[PDB]
Every structure is written in C-alpha cells, then in structure tokens.
C-alpha cells in the first residue's frame, strides 16, 4: 500500500526488497520484523510462481506470520 | 586558577623542549604536583612522560648503530605535555570540593 | 511533537514519526474536502 | 654465561608483554575514527580526549621498556 | 649467577603482566570517544567520568610495576 | 639462591595475574561512559552503582597484591 | 630449598587464576549499567540482582585465594 | 620434598582452572540483567531461571575445588 | 616421589581443562536468558530445550572428572 | 618411573584438549536457543538439525577421550 | 623408556590440536541453526550446503588424528 | 632415542598448528550459511567464491601437514 | 643428534605459526561473503579486491614456509 | 652443536611471532570489502587507503623476517 | 655456547612481541576503512588523524625491534 490506495492486495510466495543494512527475500512464516528499505525494485512471486518487478521510492516492510505488507512512499 | 596556569606553562615549556630527555626533573615535578592513590599513582603519572622522552633517545641512538622517525617523536612531545596539564584538574578538582 | 496510541528500533522510528505526522495531516485533507 | 641467559629470555618477555599494549591503544585509536564519522562536528571534544586517552594507553608500554632496559644493562 | 636468573625472568614474567593493563584501560578509553560522538553536550560528565575510571584502570599496572622493580633491585 | 628463584618466578606469575584484573575492570568502566550518553538525567543511578561496582572488580586485583608480597618478603 | 620452590610458583599460578575471575564479574558489573540506561524505574529489581549476581562471581575468587594461602602457609 | 612439589604446583594448576568458571558464569549472570531490561514483567520467569542456570554454571567449579582439596590434603 | 609428580601435575592440567566446560556451558545458559524476554510465551520450547542442550554442554565436563579422578587414585 | 611420567602428562594434555571441545559444542547449542525465539514454528527444522549438528560437535571430543584412555592404559 | 616419552607427548600434542577443530566446526554449525530461522524456505541450500561445509570442518582433524595414530604405533 | 624426542616433539608441535586452521576455515564457512539466508539468488556468486575462498583456506594447513611428515619420516 | 633436536623443534614452531596465518585469512574471505550478500551488484569490485586483499593474507604465510624449510634442509 | 639449538629455536619463535601480523592486516582487509558494499561510489578513497594501511600491517612483518634470517644465517 | 642460547631465545621471543603490534594497529586501520564509507565528505579528518593514529600505533613495535637487534648484537 501507498498514502494513495493498494498497489498489492493478493497472494505471494515470496518477496525481494532492498532494506537499509541489506537485501531481504520474505517467504511465508518468516518471523514478525520491521524495516524501512531503500528506492529500488521489488521482486513479487505471486501466486504460482509468476515474477513481477516494480520500482519503488522506499517505505518501511512489515513481516508477520502470513502477510508481509508494504507501505511504500510516493518519493 | 591563575598560578596553576603558571605551572602547567613552565611544566609543558620543559616538555614541549626536551629534545635530550628530562628523565630527572619529572620526579621533582611529581613532588610539585603532588603539594595508595595519592602517594603511588601521583609519582607514576609524571614518571610516565619522562619514561616517554627517554624513549626518544633510545629510538635516535639505536637506529644510528644498524646503519653505520622525527615525526612521531615531535608529535609525541606535545601529546606529553597536554597530560600533565590534564592531571591538574584531577588533584584541584578532586580535592576542591565536595 | 506526536501522541501515543493509548533494522533498529531507534533509526525506523526516526524515519516513521516524520512520514506518520505527514499521513496525519493528509487524513485530515481529505476529511476536510468530504466535509467541505 | 648461566646468568646473563636470564637476564636476555627477560628481556624477551618483556619484548611480548608489548603485543598486549599495541592492541589495547589500537582499540583506543579505532573509536576515534569511527566517532569523526559520525561527529565531525565534536571534532573539539575528539581531539582533547585522544591526547589524555591515548596517553594513559601509552604509559605502561614505557613502564615495560624501563623494565626492559633494567634486565638489559642492569 | 643462578639466584639472579630467577629474579630476571620474574622481572620479564611481570612485563607481560602489562599486557592486560593496556588492554583493559584501551577498553575504558574507547568508550569515551564513543560517548561524545552520541553527546557532545555531556562532555561534563564524561571529563569528569574519564579522571575517575581511567584512574582504576592505571592502578594495578603501577601495583605490578612496584613488584617488577622489587624483583630487579631487591 | 635456589629457593629464592622460587620466590622470585612467583612474584612475576602474580604479577601476570593483574593482565586479567585490568581488563574486567575495564569492561566495567566502559559500559558507565557507554550509560551516560543515553540518560545523562541517570547519573543519580550510575554514579552510585560506579562506587559498588569499581569496588567488586578491584577486590581480587588487591587479594593478589597481597599474595605477590607474601611471596617477596616472606 | 627444592619443596619451597613448588610451593611458590603454586602460589603464583594460583594467582593467574584470578586473572579470569575479575574478568567473569566485570562481565556481570557492565550489564547492570547497561541496564541502567533503559530501565530507572527498574534499579529495584536490578539493585536486589546485584547482590546476588555478584556473589556467585566472587565466590570462586575467594576459593582460590584459600588455595594460594594454602599453597603458602602449610 | 620432591613428592609435595607435585602435589603444590597441582593446586596451583587447579586455581587457574577457575578461571574460565568464573568467566562461564558471568556470561550468565549478565543475560539476566540484560532480560530484566526488555522485560520487567517477565521476572517471575527470570529468577525461576536465574537459581537453574546458575547452579548449573556453579557444579564443575565446585568440582576443581574437590580436586584441588584432595592434591593438597591427599 | 617421581612418579607421583606426573599423576600430580596430570590432575593440574585436567582441572585446566575445565576452565572451557564451564564457558561454553555459560554460552548455552545465557541464550536461555535472551529468549525468555522475547518470548515468555515460549517458555515450554525453552525449558524442554534447557535440559537437552545442558545436558550436552556438561557431559565432556564429567569425563574430564574421570579422567582426574584416574589420575589421582589410579 | 620415568615412563610412567611421560604416559601421567599425556593424560593431562588430553584433558586441555577438552577445554576446545566444550566451548565449539556450546557455540552450536546456543543458536539454538536464539533460533527458538525468532521461529517457535520452526523447531521441527530446529530439532532434527539439533541431533546432526550436536553429534558432529561431539566426536572428536569422544576421538580425544580413547586417545587419553590409551595413554592411561597402553 | 626415553624414546617412548617423546611419542607419548606428540599423542597428547595431537590430542591439544582437536581443541581447534572443534571449535571452527562449531562456527559453521552455528550458522546453520541462525540461517534456518530466517529463512526455512531456503533448507534446501542450507542442507546442501551444510554437508559441503561439514565435510572441509572435519578434514583437518581427520589428518590429526592419522598423525596421532602415527606417534603411537608408529 | 634423544634425537627421535626432537622428531616427535615436533609433530606434536605441528598438529598444534592446526588448531587455527580449523578455527579460521570455520570462519570463511559461517559466512556462506549466513549469505544463503540473505540472499537464496545469490547462490551462483556464493558457490563460486565458496572453492576460491576455501582453497586458500585449507593451503597453510595442507603445508603444515607436510612439515610434519618430514619431521616424522626425515 | 643434539643439534638436530634444535633444527626439528624449530619446524615445529614454525608449523606453530601457520595457525595465525590461516586465521587471518579467514577474517578477509568472510567478508567477502558477506558483501555479495549485499551487493551482489559489486562483484566486480569484490572480485578484484579479493585477489588484491587475499595475497597479502598469504605471504607472510609462505615466508614462513621457506624459514621451517630452512631449519629442515639447512 | 648446542650454539645452533638456540640459533634454530630462535628462527621457530620468529616464524611464530607472524601468526599475529597475517592477523592484523586481514582486519585491515576485511574493513575494505565491508565498505565497498556500503559505497561502491568512494572506491576512489578505498583503493588510496588500501596501499597507505597495507603497508603498515606489513612492514613489522618483514621486520621480523629480517631478524629470522639473522638468527639462521648470523 | 651457552650465553648465545639465551640471547637467541630472546630474539624470538622479541619477535613473538610483535605478534601483538600488527593486530592493534590493524584495528586502528580498519576503522578508517569503515569511517570513508559512512562520510567520504571527512576524508580530512580521516587522513589527518591517519597518521597520528597510525604513529602512536608502530611506536612500541619500533621500540621491541631495537630490543630485538640488542640481543642479537649486544
């Protein structure tokens, strides 16, 4: 989600975001954590293994049990 | 205050000098200074930077034996002599109050 | 200064307090636009 | 003979009570560096405190020199 | 001659003694440059902090420069 | 003569024994000028847990003083 | 003479034990003033463990000084 | 004579033993404090612990002690 | 006598080798601390873990004691 | 005699051995611990990696103890 | 009798080796155990790469061990 | 005899110099498990690296190994 | 005979040495491994570092070599 | 004879005296490639303080291998 | 003879001593390496304090050197 609406609302297998000490791939009952990342591209596996990248400004990552969301900054 | 200033200024003088030890005359600085911590340390601490000059000769006349440097050692004088104003301020502070 | 709701902790919430306060006041935009 | 291979297996030993000093005043040193990165501004407070620290971290190599040369030249 | 090895290697013995004196102390020193990187502004405290652990820190490497001095000249 | 080498090489062990007091000491110290930094308004609490706490680390560094000058002077 | 030689450097090496033990407390010591820092409102429980705490880390040092006194006197 | 020096440098070998003991339970001592920190709340889980590992970290130190009891008393 | 000054010396150099049991244990020990604070919720993990993995960490610290006690009274 | 003495330091050296063995098994243990924390869930994965990982941490503790029981008895 | 001293002693030499290699298997083991909470998803590498890593741990000792067995049957 | 104790003695000494290697093969190992974690994808560059950086890992103990043989077999 | 007892414990030391050199390496590889996980996007500069960065951690390594080849062949 | 027992035993101390330089300089190495990943940007300043700080970490190293080729070669 | 055997010995403990140099002041350096990725802007006062960091440093390494070449050459 961004300040503006939700860019992913769905299910993923995995994701791949640049944080701030390093790069992290999330996959599913990775343990709760909070991370602010830096601008780049994300990687999203949803579903059945369909890779998507997109660009991103930076925000903060949150892991918990199932769903990890993104809040993603505009800028 | 202002004496203390008077003797750090004559104590830096001679360290800041040196140039040929001053192994001696740091034992008579200590008994200056000083007028288990108070009696052992107070001699240690001024012996400490004398010990640190006669370094300077043993670094000089050594090296000169293997063939027949500076900047370390003049930097190392000026580091010296901050020390002995800086332990000033623990027997005036110390002992002023409480 | 903010209220309380009643890789460090330390750096995420250096970034957090200024981006939250910036939400706040974009909640209220559209609060006051509906309103309005 | 016999007396002087204590006096020089002395200076020897004293030769490696150095490794120790070496180290804990390049933990000294370290702090320093990494302190100016995130400080440039303390740079004042920096400068003051390496002369006083790095002089305490100094003191007890000389004392061992001494010692060294005592077991040395007697 | 043979009492005297004794006596030198002790001196030695208590050289490397200093090895850990400089070590810890470099310890305490170091946490000082850390400090003012973090707070310029308790630069009072950490003075005052500076005279009094640094202090202990030296106090047992002068203790075993006596002993080293006692080993060397009776 | 030989069972002052004894006596001698004692003394020096002990002296090798104050490397370790040093640095625990040390370890102490560091964590007070580490404490200050985040709460200043703290003091209160760290200056009076600095007393006990210096105490405790020094104690042993004394307790081998003493068994160094038992083994010097009898 | 020869038996008196063991005895000394017993008593040596008894105090080069302590070099680990003034090590282990410092350990312990370092912790409270870290804890300090977080948690003020906490020197209750922190005050109560630090008695506590730092009698296991002593305990051992006394042992071993019994031993060295052993060592030394009989 | 000869016999007792072996007995006499075994206790002192012992001694340095503890050493690491003090050390090893220091470690645990520290995590405590640590805990009490985050979680004041969670005490009652912290002293349970504190007896259990403690003791643990305690017995083989306890044990030294034995041995050492027995090289000098037979 | 002679003989006797190897089996003594041998039960030295094995309370040496204690000095690291009760460190890696204190390692084991201190982990258990951590993770109550994060997870009190947990403690039934932990405790089942606390004896198996303690459990491990003591074993080579009472076949160390055997080999001692072998030493010792043959 | 004299051979014995040989066989007698042996069995000590064996028991430093120890000291290692203790310390990188305690290494393995407390991830463990740690892992537990960040992923309850997990400990399937945790408790079958516990058997592999401890076993290798044991074994050349246990090559050690035949080679001390060799030394012991031939 | 002499010449069987100096094979007795390189056992135990050999026997002090191990205390390494122990711990830097330990080292890798304990990496395993931190990587498998972050990442269960990944075991698959971890799995691969935990008999790769393992198995260059070990090697080291293996060798040791032939050495040993040398110095004690020739 | 007396020429073959020099021999032995130093395989001894040679298999001691294995214990850094171990613990410094260890090392370069506990990176790669923590690498995987971080990034899976990254797999191609971290096997790669994981024979190159291996490989220079492992030359210093095999050359130890050959001094030994040397010592032992002329 | 005498002589070559000197020489064949000289290799020993030298062997001795190696376990430094294999430490300090491993420092370098590991973190190597640990910026691929990183940068993965660096490698090049990585790649060339690791050439650079590993020679230096291997010379001092072979230097030694020569020195125990010396005391072996003359 | 008995002269080059001390000559070779002294080049053995020197070749283990570089166990601690291989040491200092992969510190030095390690932090470059740390920074690499943080800042590929500042290569330009890495690769200037690459020289200046390995050179440093080298120099004692070949001052030690000066006084090895002493003691072998007179 | 004799005499030239405790002066050897001497040479290579001095060179031991340096074991210790290249790791403090490989600490020192590693700081500046990690300083340059955080503030490439304090290059300045990177570099300045370069030197008198650097400096304090190899002192001690330079004074064990002249002790070195005593021994050697009276």
């Given amino acids: 989600v ?74 | 205050x202002x004496x203390x200033x008077x003797x750090x200024x004559x104590x830096x003088x001679x360290x800041x000098x040196x140039x040929x030890x001053x192994x001696x005359x740091x034992x008579x600085x200590x008994x200056x200074x000083x007028x288990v911590i108070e009696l052992i340390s107070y001699f240690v601490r001024p012996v400490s930077h004398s010990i640190r000059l006669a370094g300077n000769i043993m670094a000089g006349h050594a090296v000169i034996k293997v063939f027949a440097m500076y900047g370390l050692e003049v930097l190392v004088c000026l580091i010296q002599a901050y020390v002995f104003t800086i332990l000033t301020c623990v027997y005036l502070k110390d002992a002023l109050h409480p | 200064p903010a209220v309380i709701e009643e890789p460090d902790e330390n750096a995420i919430l250096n970034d957090l307090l200024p981006r939250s306060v910036a939400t706040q006041v974009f909640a209220a935009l559209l609060e006051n636009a509906a309103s309005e | 003979n016999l007396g002087q291979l204590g006096q020089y297996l002395g200076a020897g030993l004293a030769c490696v009570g150095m490794a120790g000093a070496a180290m804990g005043v390049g933990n000294v040193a370290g702090n320093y560096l990494a302190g100016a990165l995130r400080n440039p501004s303390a740079a004042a407070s920096q400068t003051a405190t390496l002369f006083i620290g790095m002089a305490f971290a100094e003191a007890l190599g000389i004392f061992s020199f001494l010692v060294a040369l005592l077991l040395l030249f007697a």
């Fill in chain 1, 2 to 75: 961004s300040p503006e609406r939700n860019l992913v609302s769905v299910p993923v297998r995995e994701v791949r975001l640049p944080g701030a000490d390093g790069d992290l791939t999330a996959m599913p009952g990775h343990a709760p954590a909070i991370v602010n990342l830096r601008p780049g591209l994300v990687t999203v596996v949803a579903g059945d293994g369909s890779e998507t990248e997109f660009a991103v400004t930076g925000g903060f990552a949150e892991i918990n049990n199932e769903s990890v969301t993104l809040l993603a900054e505009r800028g």
